[PDB]
Scaffold this active site. Sequence first.
Site, PDB file in Angstrom:
ATOM      1  N   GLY A   1       0.494  -1.202   0.486  1.00  0.00           N
ATOM      2  CA  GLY A   1      -0.025  -0.551   0.253  1.00  0.00           C
ATOM      3  C   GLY A   1       0.777   1.008  -0.092  1.00  0.00           C
ATOM      4  O   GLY A   1       0.354   1.957  -0.641  1.00  0.00           O
TER       5      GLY A   1
ATOM      6  N   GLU B   1       4.473   4.651   5.866  1.00  0.00           N
ATOM      7  CA  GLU B   1       2.992   3.088   5.262  1.00  0.00           C
ATOM      8  C   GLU B   1       1.809   4.260   4.776  1.00  0.00           C
ATOM      9  O   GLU B   1       2.081   5.792   5.062  1.00  0.00           O
ATOM     10  CB  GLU B   1       2.389   3.556   7.505  1.00  0.00           C
ATOM     11  CG  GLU B   1       2.804   2.123   8.280  1.00  0.00           C
ATOM     12  CD  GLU B   1       1.765   1.245   7.386  1.00  0.00           C
ATOM     13  OE1 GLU B   1       2.273   1.132   6.513  1.00  0.00           O
ATOM     14  OE2 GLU B   1       2.259   0.390   8.582  1.00  0.00           O
TER      15      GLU B   1
ATOM     16  N   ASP C   1      -5.181   2.578  11.357  1.00  0.00           N
ATOM     17  CA  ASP C   1      -5.714   2.288  11.379  1.00  0.00           C
ATOM     18  C   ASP C   1      -6.122   2.043  12.852  1.00  0.00           C
ATOM     19  O   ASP C   1      -6.160   2.773  13.809  1.00  0.00           O
ATOM     20  CB  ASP C   1      -6.715   1.035  10.423  1.00  0.00           C
ATOM     21  CG  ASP C   1      -8.438   0.525  10.731  1.00  0.00           C
ATOM     22  OD1 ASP C   1      -8.962   1.132  11.236  1.00  0.00           O
ATOM     23  OD2 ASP C   1      -8.986  -0.732  10.364  1.00  0.00           O
TER      24      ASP C   1
ATOM     25  N   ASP D   1      -4.999  -0.517  -1.845  1.00  0.00           N
ATOM     26  CA  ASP D   1      -6.672  -1.609  -3.245  1.00  0.00           C
ATOM     27  C   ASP D   1      -7.330  -1.654  -1.979  1.00  0.00           C
ATOM     28  O   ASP D   1      -8.062  -1.598  -0.948  1.00  0.00           O
ATOM     29  CB  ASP D   1      -6.216  -2.987  -2.992  1.00  0.00           C
ATOM     30  CG  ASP D   1      -5.238  -3.848  -1.488  1.00  0.00           C
ATOM     31  OD1 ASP D   1      -5.032  -3.003  -0.678  1.00  0.00           O
ATOM     32  OD2 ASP D   1      -6.062  -4.688  -1.778  1.00  0.00           O
TER      33      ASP D   1
ATOM     34  N   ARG E   1      -5.055   0.202  -6.779  1.00  0.00           N
ATOM     35  CA  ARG E   1      -4.181   0.860  -6.626  1.00  0.00           C
ATOM     36  C   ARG E   1      -3.740   1.807  -7.520  1.00  0.00           C
ATOM     37  O   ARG E   1      -3.037   2.513  -6.964  1.00  0.00           O
ATOM     38  CB  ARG E   1      -2.915   0.026  -6.342  1.00  0.00           C
ATOM     39  CG  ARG E   1      -3.239  -1.121  -4.892  1.00  0.00           C
ATOM     40  CD  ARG E   1      -2.041  -2.092  -4.956  1.00  0.00           C
ATOM     41  NE  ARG E   1      -2.042  -3.518  -3.927  1.00  0.00           N
ATOM     42  CZ  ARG E   1      -2.664  -3.923  -2.975  1.00  0.00           C
ATOM     43  NH1 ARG E   1      -2.087  -2.463  -1.973  1.00  0.00           N
ATOM     44  NH2 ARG E   1      -3.097  -4.716  -2.288  1.00  0.00           N
TER      45      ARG E   1
HETATM   46  O1  LIG Z   1      -9.384   2.063   5.278  1.00  0.00           O
HETATM   47  C1  LIG Z   1      -8.756   1.405   4.600  1.00  0.00           C
HETATM   48  N1  LIG Z   1      -7.807   0.873   2.897  1.00  0.00           N
HETATM   49  C2  LIG Z   1      -7.081  -0.054   2.365  1.00  0.00           C
HETATM   50  N2  LIG Z   1      -6.356  -0.597   3.197  1.00  0.00           N
HETATM   51  C3  LIG Z   1      -6.519  -0.019   4.657  1.00  0.00           C
HETATM   52  C4  LIG Z   1      -7.300   0.848   5.386  1.00  0.00           C
HETATM   53  N3  LIG Z   1      -7.224   1.062   6.624  1.00  0.00           N
HETATM   54  C5  LIG Z   1      -6.093   0.182   6.657  1.00  0.00           C
HETATM   55  N4  LIG Z   1      -5.658  -0.725   5.780  1.00  0.00           N
HETATM   56  C6  LIG Z   1      -4.608  -1.330   5.782  1.00  0.00           C
HETATM   57  O2  LIG Z   1      -4.527  -2.254   6.791  1.00  0.00           O
HETATM   58  C7  LIG Z   1      -2.760  -2.239   7.839  1.00  0.00           C
HETATM   59  C8  LIG Z   1      -2.894  -2.208   8.772  1.00  0.00           C
HETATM   60  O3  LIG Z   1      -3.749  -1.413   9.609  1.00  0.00           O
HETATM   61  P1  LIG Z   1      -3.660  -1.668  11.212  1.00  0.00           P
HETATM   62  O4  LIG Z   1      -2.965  -2.744  12.094  1.00  0.00           O
HETATM   63  O5  LIG Z   1      -5.221  -1.498  11.995  1.00  0.00           O
HETATM   64  O6  LIG Z   1      -3.157   0.534  11.919  1.00  0.00           O
HETATM   65  C9  LIG Z   1      -2.894  -1.190   6.765  1.00  0.00           C
HETATM   66  O7  LIG Z   1      -1.581  -0.359   6.248  1.00  0.00           O
HETATM   67  C10 LIG Z   1      -3.679  -0.658   4.938  1.00  0.00           C
HETATM   68  O8  LIG Z   1      -2.600  -1.695   3.961  1.00  0.00           O
END
Ligand SMILES: O=c1[nH]cnc2c1ncn2[C@@H]1O[C@H](COP(=O)(O)O)[C@@H](O)[C@H]1O
Lengths: 164, 164
Positions: free
Chosen positions: A44, A87, A91, A147, A153
């Site tokens: 991403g 990054e 999220d 994505d 993407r």
């Molecule tokens: O809204 C979104 N759209 C696309 N990818 C997301 C989104 N939210 C989280 N991600 C993916 O989830 C990964 C890690 O999320 P986290 O560990 O919950 O902070 C991020 O690096 C993104 O690749």
Amino acid sequence: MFTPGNGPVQISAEAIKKRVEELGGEIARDYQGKTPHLICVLNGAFIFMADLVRAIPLPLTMDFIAISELLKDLRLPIHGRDVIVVEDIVDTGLTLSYLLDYLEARKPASVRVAALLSKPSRRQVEVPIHYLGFEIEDAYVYGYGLDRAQFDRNLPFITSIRPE
Amino acid sequence: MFTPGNGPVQISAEAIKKRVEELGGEIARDYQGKTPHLICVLNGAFIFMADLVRAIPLPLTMDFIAISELLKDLRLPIHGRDVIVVEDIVDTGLTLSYLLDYLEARKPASVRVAALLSKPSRRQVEVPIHYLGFEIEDAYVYGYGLDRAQFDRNLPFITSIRPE
Ligand SMILES: O=c1[nH]cnc2c1ncn2[C@@H]1O[C@H](COP(=O)(O)O)[C@@H](O)[C@H]1O
Ligand SMILES: O=c1[nH]cnc2c1ncn2[C@@H]1O[C@H](COP(=O)(O)O)[C@@H](O)[C@H]1O
């Protein structure tokens, strides 16, 4: 034929370009006299990374890693380096949290985080973001490297879908 | 403080931007009605990849691989897919040759190659390049993703050093 989704979050290529240039400028200023090592979290963040580094006029090195456990390991040493994690979006923060602990274990000189987006209302673990592009509401976004089931993407802008 | 080297090859960010947009347009036209799968050969091609995909208004998927043997494997299936390899520069052609044989072994629907640069006077094995940015003379180039001892991948333009 790039078309926006009907979600609540919409960020134009122009708005993204300006913000990324601003972040690059801040990094260049903060790291004057230093040689940072930027680690792009695949898949991403690769577009954010591509635009960001071109806005940082400093001598620097790079590496790429895949996380989800890690699916891609580091190739260059980080011990004693001033590391900057790049990054796509933070999220819940779980992934970044794991990544930071992993990197710190190798004893880098310092570690800062650059992220294009952040959805703080979803934060489950507090993680730092020193260079944030945009803080957004809770929504699934895509485009500009991010994505939607592996697709989209390539959209030059950030868009989203409805929670529906 | 982005400064060009004193080598014979020099390509501005503007010239690169225009060419990449042209290549993206050609790909979009050639792949109308299709859903290509672009494979970025890390680390050098990541910026070319980032700019190229944003110039291809078609539904498509992506993957990243590291080669030198491969240091990073594919994650998405390529069997039955119309694959497009995205490379930084084709020198002797040995790496691309190995990569193409590897990919063909999985029986993709088709495979085409996109490369930002090519130094044909150095070619040791004939490999195809369907979408070439620029054909250049024999020189060590860097910038726009390509490194010089891991540094200078962040230069927004392509430059070079003297063989001296
Ligand atoms: O809204 C979104 N759209 C696309 N990818 C997301 C989104 N939210 C989280 N991600 C993916 O989830 C990964 C890690 O999320 P986290 O560990 O919950 O902070 C991020 O690096 C993104 O690749
Ligand atoms: O002039 C150059 N500058 C930077 N990297 C190069 C140059 N020439 C070849 N390479 C690297 O060598 C890899 C494979 O070269 P080849 O197998 O000889 O065609 C390319 O993908 C580049 O990463």
